[PDB]
Structure 1
């Protein structure tokens, strides 16, 4: 299954929408650039299962997305550890533009 997360709410709020997503192995999360760009998607090393920097760096899309409809996807395959992956947008960090993917297992 694919879950679409908007970067910037339709309401014009600096939020990921939905901010919290629960996922099963094999699912994809697709971020779509929506309102009030730019946005990016950063996972800190201590905010993914096992605190793996190698994992968090692979998943982080640090490059800025400016155009509506730009997208980035992660397929959380069985290669991914179960647990929480907490992320944020650097440009809007002070606005609380944060999210969390929970991979069940």
Structure 2
């Protein structure tokens, strides 16, 4: 699945902000525009340790930002469920999305 992160106008949005994928399908996030952004998954409370580890592996390090030098990030989540992801710099500006894994 492909998700665009930001736009040419500098809005703090994921495009689209709700994606549904099959187990193990890569989600490629690609930066659009010049504002750097990243993608970090929220870990659901009470998630099993295998899901917590998958989500951490599918998250950017919060000291990492996409830039036109590092324009994409690829995440794979195998466990069925819905998961929220957010951008660290623009979290308070509600730059967040949902990933449903079938």
What interval of TM-score do these two structures reach, taking the shorter chain for normalisation? 0.7 to 0.9
In the TM superposition, what is the alpha-carbon distance from 1:57 to its structure 2 partner?
Answer: 1.3
| One of 28, 31, 36 as aligned partner of 2:29 | 31
1:69 to 1:33, Cα distance in 2 relative to 1, 3 A: farther
1:65 to 2:66 alignment:
yes
Higher strand fraction: Structure 1 or Structure 2?
1
| One of 81, 84, 87 as aligned partner of 1:86 | 84
In the TM superposition, what is the alpha-carbon distance from 1:37 to its structure 2 partner?
Answer: 2.0
Q: Which stretch shifts more, 94-103 or 10-19?
A: 10-19
Deviations 1:8-33 (A, max 9, x none): 03554210000100111242210001
In the TM superposition, what is the alpha-carbon distance from 1:36 to its structure 2 partner?
Answer: 4.3
- Contact kept in structure 1, 2:10 and 2:35, CA below 8 Å: no
SS in 1 for 2:57: helix
Corresponding position of 2:93: 95
1:5 to 2:3 alignment:
yes
SS in 2 for 1:45: coil
What RMSD over aligned residues (CA atoms) do the two structures have, in Å? 2.4
Where structure 2 has 5 or more consecutive residues not aligned to the other structure, the ranges are: none
Number of residue equivalences? 99
TM-score of the pair, normalised by structure 2: 0.80
Where structure 1 has 5 or more consecutive residues not aligned to the other structure, the ranges are: none
- Contact kept in structure 2, 1:14 and 1:36, CA below 8 Å: no
SS in 1 for 2:26: strand
